[PDB]
Amino acid sequence: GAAPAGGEVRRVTMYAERLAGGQMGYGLEKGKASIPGPLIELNEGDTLHVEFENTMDVPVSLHVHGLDYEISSDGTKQNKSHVEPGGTRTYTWRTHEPGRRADGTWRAGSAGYWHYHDHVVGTEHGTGGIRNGLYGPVIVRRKGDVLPDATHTIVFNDGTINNRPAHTGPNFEATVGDRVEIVMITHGEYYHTFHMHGHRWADNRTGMLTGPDDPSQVIDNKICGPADSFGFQIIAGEGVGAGAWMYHCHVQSHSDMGMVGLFLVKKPDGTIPGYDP
Amino acid sequence: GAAPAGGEVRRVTMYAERLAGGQMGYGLEKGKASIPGPLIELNEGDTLHVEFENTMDVPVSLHVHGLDYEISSDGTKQNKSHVEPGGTRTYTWRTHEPGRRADGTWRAGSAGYWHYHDHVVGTEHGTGGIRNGLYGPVIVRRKGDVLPDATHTIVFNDGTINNRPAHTGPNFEATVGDRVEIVMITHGEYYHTFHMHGHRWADNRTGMLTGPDDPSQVIDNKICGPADSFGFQIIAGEGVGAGAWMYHCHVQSHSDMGMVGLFLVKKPDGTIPGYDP
Amino acid sequence: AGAAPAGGEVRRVTMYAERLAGGQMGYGLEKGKASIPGPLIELNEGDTLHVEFENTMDVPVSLHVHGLDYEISSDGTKQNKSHVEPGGTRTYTWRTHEPGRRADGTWRAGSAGYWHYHDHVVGTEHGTGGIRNGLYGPVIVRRKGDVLPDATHTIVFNDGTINNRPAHTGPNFEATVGDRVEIVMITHGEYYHTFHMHGHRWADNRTGMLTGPDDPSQVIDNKICGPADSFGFQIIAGEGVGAGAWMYHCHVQSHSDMGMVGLFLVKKPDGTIPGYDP
Ligand SMILES: [Cu+2]
Ligand SMILES: [Cu+2]
Ligand SMILES: [Cu+2]
Ligand SMILES: [Cu+2]
Ligand SMILES: [Cu+2]
Ligand SMILES: [Cu+2]
Ligand SMILES: [Cu+2]
Ligand SMILES: [Cu+2]
Ligand SMILES: [Cu+2]
Ligand SMILES: [Cu+2]
Ligand SMILES: [Cu+2]
Ligand code: NA
Ligand code: NA
């Protein structure tokens, strides 16, 4: 599968809602908010109209990295781009293809692994909102990009993965040979290093080398800090086989205190060697 | 415009001077020291003789990243290349173009976003001098590099931008369509993440993709540590329009305590929609 | 300079985990000769390595490698019981592969790069004690045609030490002007660092050297790194700058002030170093 050329005007509804235990999340339908928020996928050239509604009792906003937006969709109190309690607003995101500018230089396209998050809860930089769970992934694909069999989002938010209690994953399941896309986002106060056992990727836009001329370092460990985002695709078990393959932050106290999960790679018969749950 | 081939021998006078409040700065002329220090620009092949004078009552030095220098211009006490109080010294920086060696390998040129700083005030690694403001940017351009309409230097020094009081910018002004160059240097004890709203750049030498075959990640958020330097050029307002575009460190406590500033992008008539400080 | 050949050899080596002085712990290829960092392993893409491993200590230990191909039975974790009991033995197998076009037209990245191995089970189930104690070492996998160096030096930022040495004690590395010197740089523990080399620079890519005039990788002399990061590069000692005692150090200011410093001692042909007075 390959991404097509973009150019569609898409729309979606988004809600900010309180969740259990002081948390807050984005959802695409009322009562269905999650942490991380829903995955938004666009092709270069697509436009996205996000009909947003704040269902909480405190102001919230929606700020996006990487994509084109006018200052009116910045999502900050400073620009009156926030949403009052009960309020509604339409945030508009646009994307563009790469291309040669009139001045002769190459204009980078929108394609990449991006994310959106709150910018007004607790502070005017969204410190409380991000801590509470108001973040989500955005993928913009370029014409011809390889499409995956599954996509999984891993957010290192302070000392947690996806706001979960320590030592509770998440885990992700695949079958040997699956083409698996990982979106990796970092938030909060701390730097982290993301490590995946049994697998590696290229440190470039897609995480895949373009061919024999791409000099990007191939890695299995990557330092990241607050609001960094990257992504990659792997072939599950390629050259290594089935198994419970760990991923974790490699900062030693962070892995010891529980930012660890499993990439559960199954044989075609659905079983995982060496793994007792 | 485009950078010419280099090869000139250039001279400049530089002074280290005390500034108000225990600060120290470099300057091109007596009594005009600034933090950051003056921007030095060279073309690959140029030689620069810095006629240096220490107007201060403590030793100071000038150490440069990236450029060619002999051990006698290292700027360290260890090599006896510091400057005594009231003393003078000529620091020589050289640069070179890339090219094929005899062994067939490719020698990397000097071009890049670099910086200079003190190496002896407070400690033999310049911890006091750097804290006090003794740092500045150097740009070395390759023949053919695109030249910007303006260059702005942003230094994350511990918990400050350019040693400024918290919450005091700096702000930079441009018109929609301007080609704006940012030089980004980090110093001190902390890691940071630099983020720009509404704009993005390529993670490579120039900050611009060379063309459709360049696989560098396109980003708007970059982790950086002490003595890191990078730079890029953006088209102000490209695809997003005029506005007060924030830049800040994205480490949540840092943005909250005042590591924030504004990229004020004006329409040709001078208007900035919705700006209201 | 020499060039790496195509790989595909099947090799075997013995490795031991051993206690060292001061509560330290190290890997070695011969009994009683363990070192921190552990021995440098070098493979050409396509090679297979069978590590006949023996744990001579009184605690379970493991061998976990980054980047290379290994089956789950060579993961080196308690999770899948691939650690080594006290006094026990185990064969760990590492494989590597060349890059190539898959049948579906996508490009498979090869194994080549700067990698490392370390313990994963001493103290905690992530090897916090083992790594702190010194159980780490470098692995280089070369691609056919990679340029070969005159010498290779490994620098590990482990917590606030270099190579588990006492503060301010280097290590120093010696070269002659013109030498092709390879640096392998590994980070472990709890802290981020920035590695800086005076007088020298490299390209931020797989090999540390630009492939030619079309490579847009940033050329740098300073690089941020965190726990279990690894990278490497080659420089021509003294190129364009001459002989001297060229410092390298973490550039986090308090780390350089506390002793995360060392010297790249670049000598004239007559063996002397101008300005270097110890
Ligand atoms: Cu912001
Ligand atoms: Cu972490
Ligand atoms: Cu953000
Ligand atoms: Cu230094
Ligand atoms: Cu910061
Ligand atoms: Cu932003
Ligand atoms: Cu420095
Ligand atoms: Cu692990
Ligand atoms: Cu350090
Ligand atoms: Cu330096
Ligand atoms: Cu590891
Ligand atoms: Na790169
Ligand atoms: Na990087």
Residue numbers in the entry:
A (entry chain B), B (entry chain C): 41 to 317
C (entry chain A): 40 to 317
Relevant lines from the article:
Laccases (EC 1.10.3.2) are multi-copper oxidases that catalyze the oxidation of various organic and inorganic molecules (e.g., mono- and di-phenols, polyphenols, diamines, aminophenols, aromatic or aliphatic amines) with the reduction of molecular oxygen to water. Substrate oxidation occurs near the Cu1 ion (named T1 center), and electrons are then transferred via the Cys-His pathway to the Cu2 and Cu3α-Cu3β (TNC), where the reduction of oxygen to water takes place. 2D laccases are homotrimeric proteins, with Cu1 ions of monomers lying in one plane at an equal distance from each other and forming the so-called equilateral triangle.
